[PDB]
Design a binder for this molecule. Structure first.
Ligand code: HEM
Ligand code: HEM
Ligand SMILES: CNCCN(C)c1cccc(CCc2cc(C)cc(N)n2)n1
Ligand SMILES: CNCCN(C)c1cccc(CCc2cc(C)cc(N)n2)n1
Ligand SMILES: [Cl-]
Ligand SMILES: [Cl-]
Lengths: 362, 362
């Protein structure tokens, strides 16, 4: 069954990929090569062209992603050659540096060797390559609650956080053959962070808020033509609402709305004053202002939705079916102000794509 | 097939209704009475208790409605006795008066005779009993665009609007046997309206905005135990976002955000300033403030979601499955600030319920 699944996925991907690349005449011979390769080895190896276009198609097929207009300019780094934990570490350091690009963020994916018999070659434990630690002990909450379990797992391995609200977690990953992951502290020179200030309200800096520049998801599986790249971290630039309406605002994250209300000079006592909504708007204005002022890439949700509208138009013009997940495409601030809110989307799963996988901690 | 559908729906409804009312021992005899009644007449007649509880269950089963905590206090008015258009008109005038209750809004439904062989006895053309007219001619848009087709249909029948931005549409409905609906101007003494002002910004009144107090949906079908009450107008009180984030804000409705931005003293030039979000918050604050100041019932979306959370808890405690439509339950302002955003809902259809039906205009 395994090989049959692989071969069927392979035929569908190669046909589609080569058609898009204008190389349809080569499909037959390539498929023959593949079929024999599967027969002999139990798997097959993507050409660099297939891997690159496959990663791009996967992004294009990501139903929940509003940022898909730019799918074809994804920067794909082929690291299927890595064999050592130093090579992996250095490839991850390099991804951060090249994606960050001094603030002019480049959407990038680094692709490590794929699973073989479902056996992972490299297993990345981080949810994002750059993320803050979280702690909870004796009623005291410090840092990002979303990172509590990973933070505890790191501290089991000999790492120790300073217990600031913004401790950078180390990179942590496990190699095939090793029982325990290794961890490496992030060189701070690699990590751009942005202090949050407000364009009009000087007191906003009193909150001492900041966030990191580049979100780099490192725990999803890239699937291309039946091959499972469980380790393939990717990044874009932030949409401001992710920081201002979720990371800093959610009660189960940094939970800052009451403190925001206070610094902007409004009462936080009555639902009918809409103080939470007002605080959310000002926090989200501060986030965009701060990233722009520092020269770090960011997009606001209105511009992002406008770009997504163009992605819809491009899909129809290219004769491709559009798929989307309305519940994730609408922004968490003023969603009815975007065209997304007012239409529906087919939530069908198309491959290549990115998929969740089980955490090795928890 | 018709009678079989009716009989099956009847058995399911009577069993459930009588169980909830603690009258399960009476189910068998009542069902016998019903089965014979269907045999002889082709239909059956609800007792006043069944009709009342059926209307309440229907509201309780309305997946898209955040206001369902109060389903059991719905005020049901049985008008299955009406036969003349004057009786219908007067029943609709009465609904407005009793539901309005001098501003202390009472959720109310008035139930007219049901369809017989799919033949309607009374056909109400209004979408809501109280709504503003809309006009479009030679590039000029006046009033509420959502009412353009109904307004044109009214003016075909001899009505003429003053072409203000807030013309009250007449009541319009058709009786069985008549080819044309009749229309009746609404007595203004029956209609409470609220001028929109802002608690802090005096200039807000310069926009000369207002809205009506009571939303009374009059074009949905109530279905109870296989009986189709196509004419059964119902009302609640508004959630403020319906007025401030949709009716006055949508580009295809009153489209006021640019004018709001100007009166609150902010630029409306850059997406990254989040001027639309800021305008939406202030407009929505003004709406709540204005209804409260005038003593007209209204709920803000935070309080409404808190009530809905209690509805969820009540459902589990009563051993009833909960159904909901996430896409409609989340408010259009700060949805992630509500618990609704962070969970999922089973969107299954349970009867009794309210259903869309074809418009007789358009
Ligand atoms: C260029 C800037 C980008 C922006 C602003 C953006 C924005 C977003 C947002 C807001 C989400 C919603 C998920 C959440 O909030 O937790 C999302 C989902 C997603 N994005 Fe993007 N994205 C971008 C680039 C990328 C890239 C480069 C990839 C991969 C190559 C990608 C793949 C995805 C995937 C797979 C999801 C769904 C994750 C899930 O199911 O939980 N995005 N994106
Ligand atoms: C008491 C105050 C009430 C509030 C604040 C409320 C709020 C809402 C809101 C915001 C919607 C979303 C639909 C839209 O925005 O267009 C809705 C849907 C609905 N409500 Fe309520 N509601 C209330 C009372 C009632 C009552 C009394 C009934 C019937 C007895 C009812 C039946 C429904 C139905 C059937 C829908 C779905 C309509 C559709 O599918 O388009 N509601 N409600
Ligand atoms: C619902 N999403 C769960 C968390 N995961 C797996 C996830 C996956 C993709 C994107 C996100 C949001 C963080 C993010 C990532 C990227 C690549 C870009 C961006 N603007 N924001 N999160
Ligand atoms: C998506 N809804 C389409 C318009 N319809 C049919 C509809 C039906 C029920 C409720 C609404 C919103 C207006 C309304 C009605 C009622 C009874 C209460 C309320 N707060 N708001 N609209
Ligand atoms: Cl994030
Ligand atoms: Cl309305």
């Amino acid at each position: 069954e395994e090989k049959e699944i692989l071969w069927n996925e392979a035929k569908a991907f190669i046909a589609a990929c080569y058609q898009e690349l204008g190389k349809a005449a080569e499909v037959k011979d390539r498929l023959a090569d593949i079929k024999s390769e599967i027969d002999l080895t139990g798997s097959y190896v993507h050409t660099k062209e297939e891997l690159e276009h496959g990663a791009k198609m996967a992004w294009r097929n990501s139903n929940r992603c509003i940022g898909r207009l730019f799918w074809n300019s994804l920067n794909v780094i082929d690291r299927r050659d890595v064999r050592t934990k130093e090579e992996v570490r250095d490839a991850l350091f390099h991804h951060i540096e090249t994606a960050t690009n001094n603030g002019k963020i480049r959407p990038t994916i680094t692709i490590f060797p794929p699973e073989e018999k479902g056996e992972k070659q490299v297993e990345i434990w981080n949810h994002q390559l750059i993320r803050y630690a979280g702690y909870e002990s004796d009623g005291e909450r410090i840092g990002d609650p979303a990172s509590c379990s990973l933070t505890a797992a790191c501290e089991e391995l000999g790492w120790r956080g300073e217990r600031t609200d913004f401790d950078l977690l180390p990179l942590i990953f496990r190699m095939k053959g090793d029982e325990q992951p290794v961890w490496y502290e992030l060189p701070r020179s690699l990590v751009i962070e942005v202090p949050i200030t407000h364009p009009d309200i000087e007191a906003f800096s009193d909150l001492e808020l900041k966030w990191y520049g580049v979100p780099i998801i490192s725990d999803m599986k890239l699937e291309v033509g039946g091959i499972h790249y469980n380790a393939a971290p990717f990044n874009g630039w932030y949409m401001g609402t992710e920081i201002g309406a979720r990371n800093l605002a959610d009660e189960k994250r940094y939970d800052k709305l009451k403190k925001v209300a206070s610094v902007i000079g409004i009462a936080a006592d009555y639902n009918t004053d809409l103080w939470k909504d007002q605080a959310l708007v000002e926090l989200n204005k501060a986030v965009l202002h701060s990233y722009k002022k520092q020269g770090v890439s960011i997009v606001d949700h209105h511009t992002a939705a406008s770009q997504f509208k163009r992605f819809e138009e491009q899909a129809e013009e290219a004769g491709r079916k559009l798929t989307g997940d309305w519940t994730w495409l609408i922004p968490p601030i003023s969603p009815a102000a975007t065209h997304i809110f007012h239409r529906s989307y087919d939530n069908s799963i198309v491959k290549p794509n990115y998929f969740y996988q089980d955490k090795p901690y928890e």
